[model samples]
Target chain A: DIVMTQTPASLSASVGESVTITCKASGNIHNYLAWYQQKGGKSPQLLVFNASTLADGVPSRFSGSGSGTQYSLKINSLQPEDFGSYYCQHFWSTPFTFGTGTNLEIKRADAAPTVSIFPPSSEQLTSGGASVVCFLNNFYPKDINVKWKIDGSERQGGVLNSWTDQDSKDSTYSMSSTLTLTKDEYERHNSYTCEATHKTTTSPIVKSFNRNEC
Target chain B: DIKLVESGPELKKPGETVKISCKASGYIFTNYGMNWVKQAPGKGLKWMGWINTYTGEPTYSDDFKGRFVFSLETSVRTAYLQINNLKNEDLATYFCARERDYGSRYRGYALDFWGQGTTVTVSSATTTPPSVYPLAPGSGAGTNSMVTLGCLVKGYFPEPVTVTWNSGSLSSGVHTFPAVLQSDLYTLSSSVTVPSSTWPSETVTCNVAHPASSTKVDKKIVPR
Candidate 1:
């Protein structure tokens, strides 16, 4: 059985912008690959297969490419109707496999919502006690890095892992990571931001959550 | 362009059987085949197998070949999979699928669409003794010189079972095992005909066994 690994936990794109999901197979599944989409409360629909062949009736904008052990699903123009999760499936062997999933969100281009601090203004999160928790909403492909820093120093003693989506779309990717911080340095940190990076995107987005507010 | 619609309650129980039907709408029943699948509970997904809506021809994934039967009603554009001798391992949900060809396209083949699944439970069935039959004798029947006994026995509709010919006579021969079929509520007919001079008093025996049930049945027939 081939193992399927996907990246990026969640993604937000302005309408008309494009998003891509990359799926890497453990071995050469050749073109024996397919993409699927699952909206909330619905079965997954085959988006593309044979690496790039669109299933009959599938829209033209949804395209796939790549061969050998690597492949990807690309959405040409983000649409409001496209918000959901996407997944990659390896049909090359038994135990058909799927990627973690990526959640597609339509981020309004003009009205950027105010970034609210999750724990309120300034807060102190006990290390090994109560680390800060941030919810990366509408994100797909859950392999993002979350960090906790005291003031400006990067605190490195913690574990990070993500939550699987209760619902997944098209084998898109979904996940959440938890990072534990040093309890001794908890009082010195003013604000901690979760930074997400993607290879296909122009810049990373950082959201800071307050940890001092009890 | 065919559609399969199947929906129902989750089934639970060992030895319990469930039949899921896929109704093909929008295209000629003969144009495509219907398939079934098993997905996570509360989630809509997973591929099981397919039944040719036109010919009733069915295919099963290695995991589903036994314990499941894919059938069809061409007139209604419907395909059915009756799963029996269910076990705990069979707890996942199931779906009815549709494919473009007798064989699917895509890596590991492909399933175009699937109906929601129906779950079933397997529990103990009314108990019975393990029945075995003695091998019968073999004889050569040429032209009109001989007559034989026809063996007919009961078997489940969807479980994989084997049928064998016990020589030419029930009281004195060996047995042969054939391939498995996905039907349960049907009878299998087989026999040996020999001339009165060659016919044994007890010549043929019919046998049936359900893997999951651990039950087997057999009976002997005598020539007239």
Candidate 2:
């Protein structure tokens, strides 16, 4: 099993500027590596395959160069739309593996997002099932975490973590999360809460949707 | 391109059963394990367990031991998640991910390819229309010639949405996001940038069409 490690976990640069991401393999990959670009909420696209072959329809500005255990992906002149997470993968063995990823982003102020949770609608409640949505608005740096809690117990599994979108007008970011359950659970459980964690703030922002409070 | 797609939104009654499917494409299913994860309405993700596609062996998390099950059909390159004795806590979106093997006994590997989630609910139908809200226009946003705006769509089902600006859609400038499912409902955000000179007197409208409720909404941006 080969381990792939990417450098500069997060990068920020301006449009028209050039940037490079580097990937290192724990063992010699024998040049059997591939690069992937993952935009928000979209499936990753193959960029450079077999270490250096650029996929079809990709722009010329993108290039891959490396040998043995070291590889690099370079963008000659960055496009605004090129901002996304970049990954390096190896197909050298049975158990395929990929690098953690390099988060490419635009520089922004360290503003924290405001958190809010919306409860299930009346119609949704009456229908047998309910949907709860948690919204985070006006954050910067695009790094955020969200979790849902029922009564006091924290749950894992069906939690859908959303990709963040920027507010073009303010340059801030916004994102949302959801929880689905039966209406019976909403009636039986007393508390529904959303915990938002961000680096810009010292504490996690908390919001709850309690039927009795509403 | 390697693709993992999950389908099926189910509605069942208490003590009933529900099964969701995740199909893999562009790769051989037997080469990888089929792992399943679920998110209920009130919290984060829960790993129900995984099925070894090659051997047909299923592993379950302690929380999912009894009624939750994972299965694979190698010929079809698909994995299925089934839950018996449906309950309120079982309402969630289940996701199927391709297992990447390479680890020690306890800290082995992780999932690489992930498919879209399939929701399983009880009692109610899975169709809900979105309500649209367009924010007032922000003029000179970052520049003298640009104005930016946003539209919030909430309380909907069946994720697909069409968001257009006035009569046209802007490339790159328009950021339409996938709907975020919350407690059976969904929330969506679509934002666009236009020339600042076309606002106030001229007006910019956000047009939204949702298939779940078969509804169309038009929200004109008002200068704040």
Candidate 3:
């Protein structure tokens, strides 16, 4: 297995500016490197794979290049939404390793979203089925990923929505998701978690509640 | 855009044989191989190994050898992870991830897209108690005069453990990293931060709770 070493522990950039982060593998990787972007509280998103091929849906400004033991990820005309951490991973061998993440900071700091969870009421809990809502507020860029996990496993059947705040002067956004649980799930006393991820922080804001709790 | 969808049984008894399926869509399945990952309850991710979707060749990690089998149904664009002689430790969520490919180089095989993991729980349950270590002060950050304290908890199993920090009437922030599985046990750390002014002559406690055990373990620290 090759060890990936990334340079520049942190970088400060402004919107519309371009920046490059480099990674060097300990051994020949044969262009099997990939780059991932992880904003606070979200799973790593693949930006480039096969050394230089851009993953689907990634902005054209984010490009990758290099081969063998060296690689680089370049973000041309950085967007405010691009500020977070970037990592390079090598798939050339077993026990794949990742470079120490490079934190990408913008000229200004953005507010981290505040998260809250509303569990089912006592009456609703007794009925064996209930709905819980996770609300995230006061965030920017309008790009966020909300996920629900039941006892540590990702779950479906949740309605997630996000919209810019029409009432706020700042272009901040708010998002919310509701998860419905069946009676069996409610009785199981499983742990329910709501994770909110945005560009403002490197960690996801997580809130967890027990199904048996009111 | 490659997507992997997984389906399997949610519950099984010990010693039973189980098979989980991963169906691929949005791209040609044969162009990329599939890898399997396992996450025990509240534990970090573990690589189970990969299967060559094109040629039906399978490779298993050292820990997943023998009874663990990988197979595929090329006609349906699906892959499978089969486990024989399931044990209590086998209770976990299994995810099928797509390996990226770029022709014959055999080098671009990294897990990217993943299936919405399938959860399997063995009926018989076993428990392990955690050993809590005393809290230690971390180096202070100059600007905020912030004092950070860290606690280490180890040797726990059947996870889903909760770590918390308790201090009297002081504002502090707490963060806990995911637990790492070592063999059948787990190890984890949690940290709490408060202003330096409030740290002097204060006693903080680290508490860990798990479903397997009714009693919570508490470790205390007094910072100078």
Candidate 4:
């Protein structure tokens, strides 16, 4: 078994800036290292694996390279969404291990999103089921989390869609999530809540509505 | 991209048996492994164990041994965590997190993606009082004149509880992260900030209360 160590512990970077983080393994790892990114209140994401190979859908600006017992992840022209924590793991031996995490903080604070809820349309409301949408707009750093709760209990089955400004001139982004519930659920007078968590905001952005409002 | 979804009962009784299922989509299920985690109500997270989706191998943490079982339904791309002889302490929200793949040879190293948690409640009226600790002070971020105090509470039962401060009015800058599950108990922390000007005369008290226990525990800050 080998141990992994990360340096700097944390970092601060601005948009369009370039930054590099290093990971060191206790023994020769045979280039079997992988990198991951984890944001607040969210699961980690695979970024690089096989030492230098980028994971699927990873931006071209993010790259990895290393050999022997050393590895590195480099981000060029950093976007606001890049701010988070990163970790490196080795797979050459049993009991695979991970390095201590490195937190990436934004040098400039981004704007908090404006959130609003759209109730189910009247026709759908009259039917046996309906869909409610939560829209978040004008936020920087595209990384955001949207969750749904019914009667104060977290509920699943939310479909999320996000996009950045079509024109390259704007860096802001927008996102929306839709949750569908049956009439039986709505008629129960359950309270539906849309909670959005972001890096810039200390407290979560919450918008709640009652089923009776429909 | 990989996604995980959980299915199970929301409520159970002591001594009953329950099996929670996690289904994977959008990737080759065999290429990665699945790990299970437990989050007691209002508490932090715990790593229960993992199951190799391809080979059907299972691993368990020391605390989850004996009654906890990990199995797979490879044909349907699903993994299961079953608990037998359930107890009141077994009640919690269970989540299935996907283990990151290093290569074809090694998988199940680190967790990458997670399912929305499935909560299970074991109906019981018994409870235990939590142990509250004194407030510890530390330097606050960004300013030399500001200080932060942390209050730790541990050993609580019956799920839900509240921890607050009752002293001089403090700033609304309080932050509480998820409580952590240790063994069969839960531990949580809360932090409060005080400016240096008021630090000398400031007295902060930590209060912990739960509906299950009539005795509320209180602790005060003792300057070092």
Model 2 residue A47 CA deviation in Å: 1.2
TM-score of 2: 0.49
Report fnat for all candidates as fractions from 0 to 1: 0.10, 0.03, 0.12, 0.07
Reference contacts reproduced by model 2:
0.03
Evaluated at residue A123, the lDDT of candidate 4 is 45
- Give the lowest summed-lDDT range of ten residues in model 4 chain A: A160-169
- lDDT by residue for model 4 (A51-163), tens: 88888788989898999988999989988678777878776765456677677765554768766555554444565655555666657676889888878988775343434
- Over the stretch B1-224, how does candidate 3's per-residue lDDT look in tens digits? 56777884355679998999988999988888787877675444566778877789887767788989999999999899999999989988887878765464344375578787877867643467776654433223123476555555556765557778773333345545556555566656555667767665666777777656654877666541
For B1-224, candidate 2 gives per-residue lDDT tens digits of 77799874676777899888888998777777776766555333445666778788887766788898888788898888888999878877777877554333223234556786776766554778887765542222224575556666767876567888876744545656667666777777666666767655686778998865778988876654
Cα lDDT tens digits, model 4, B96-214, are: 87866535544345466778667777864335666655444321212357555545554566555577776425535354434544445555555565675665477677676765566
Model 1, residue A62: distance off in Å is 1.7
Residue A127 lDDT, candidate 4, scale 0-100: 56
TM of chain B, each: 0.45, 0.66, 0.54, 0.54
**lDDT against the true structure, each candidate:** 0.54, 0.70, 0.69, 0.68
10 residues in a row with least lDDT, candidate 1 chain A:
A112-121
CAPRI-style grade of the A/B interface in model 4? incorrect
Better of 3 and 4 by lDDT: 3
**TM-score against native, each model:** 0.45, 0.49, 0.47, 0.46
Give residue B100's error in model 4 in angstroms: 6.9
**Range of the 10 consecutive residues with the lowest summed lDDT in candidate 3 chain B:** B135-144
RMSD of 4: 19.1
